[PDB]
């Protein structure tokens, strides 16, 4: 379960670096729609991250 | 056409094994989207700027 | 032994739960068609 | 016009029975459920809701 | 005139056929797609999710 | 019994937690409506809070 948290997480950090590459220059648009991809990742992030230290 | 019928019939059973959310929770899971959209937003224009 | 029909009793309303559980569904569909 | 009048019946005949037809689930559906009600409270009120004497 | 009206049908009636071929693999499939639904989650139910009694 | 309760007001909890950012901002309405849910989950807890010490 550890593992996978963190597979997780690694996709959303890449939308968010990959995000971190849009805003720039005035395109606003584009980030926008690379950020709510990520909330599907980080409900997973949330989901899971409880449950390991439930677990511990 | 009867088949549709029986399509029907197992897809009536569908809505009630898992009852479907309720239209509050619709109109509240999309209402709190455009906030986290935002306020990840929010840090994001402050950030950049 | 009295003590047995609570577990008797108990399952005849199962099976109500599940024919109840049946006569819903039917209303359903016919309501789509 | 006869040909014609007599078609007419059965368009208003066919269409009269499908009618007919859908009513009869809607109402077996709901003798169902209230057949199927009867015997759930019947027995509920005879173990610990309907009168002193009861299993309960 | 009756060569040419016969062939007529004969364009109809296989233009019709096939059109009927078509639609009936789409409702198989959709078919098999509700059925190879119910089983998967009718059990779900049964494990955790549809009540108490549930074997998890 | 004990195990029962705590999901109960977990439930109510969720729907107080997510209650606690409609409010905010001006918007009352939505903040009364999930107020009025968890009443629903409350009248349970008080029923079966009260049980629990009472077996004990």
Same mark, same amino acid.
């Given at each position: ?56 | 056409?009867?088949?549709? $019928? ?33 306020? $990840? ?9 | ?6 577990? !008797? ?11 109840? !559980? !049946? ?11 | 016009?006869? &040909?014609? /009048? &007599?078609?007419?019946?059965? /368009? ?9 037809? #859908? ?9 169902? #459920?209230?057949?199927?009600? /009867? ?13 002193? #004497? #009861?299993?309960?």
């Amino acid at each position: 379960t550890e593992r996978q948290r963190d597979a997780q997480q690694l996709i959303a950090q890449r939308w968010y670096e990959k995000a971190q590459a849009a805003l720039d220059r005035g395109n606003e648009q584009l980030a926008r729609e690379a950020l709510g991809q990520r909330q599907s990742y980080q409900s997973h992030t949330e989901a899971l991250g409880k449950s390991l230290g439930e677990q511990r | 056409e009867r088949i549709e $019928t029986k399509i029907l019939e197992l897809e009536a059973e569908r809505e009630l094994l898992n009852p479907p959310p309720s239209p509050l929770d619709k109109k509240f899971e999309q209402w709190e989207e455009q906030q986290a959209v935002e306020a $990840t937003l929010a840090a994001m224009k402050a950030r950049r700027s | 032994a009295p003590e047995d029909l609570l577990e !008797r009793l108990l399952g005849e309303m199962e099976l109500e739960l599940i024919e109840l !559980r !049946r006569a819903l569904a039917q209303t359903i569909a016919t309501f789509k068609s | 016009a006869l &040909v014609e /009048q &007599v078609r007419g019946q059965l /368009q208003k005949l066919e269409r009269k029975y499908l009618e007919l037809k #859908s009513q009869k689930n809607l109402y077996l559906a709901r003798l169902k #459920s209230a057949i199927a009600a /009867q015997k759930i409270e019947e027995i509920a009120g005879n173990l610990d809701n309907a009168s002193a #004497s #009861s299993l309960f």
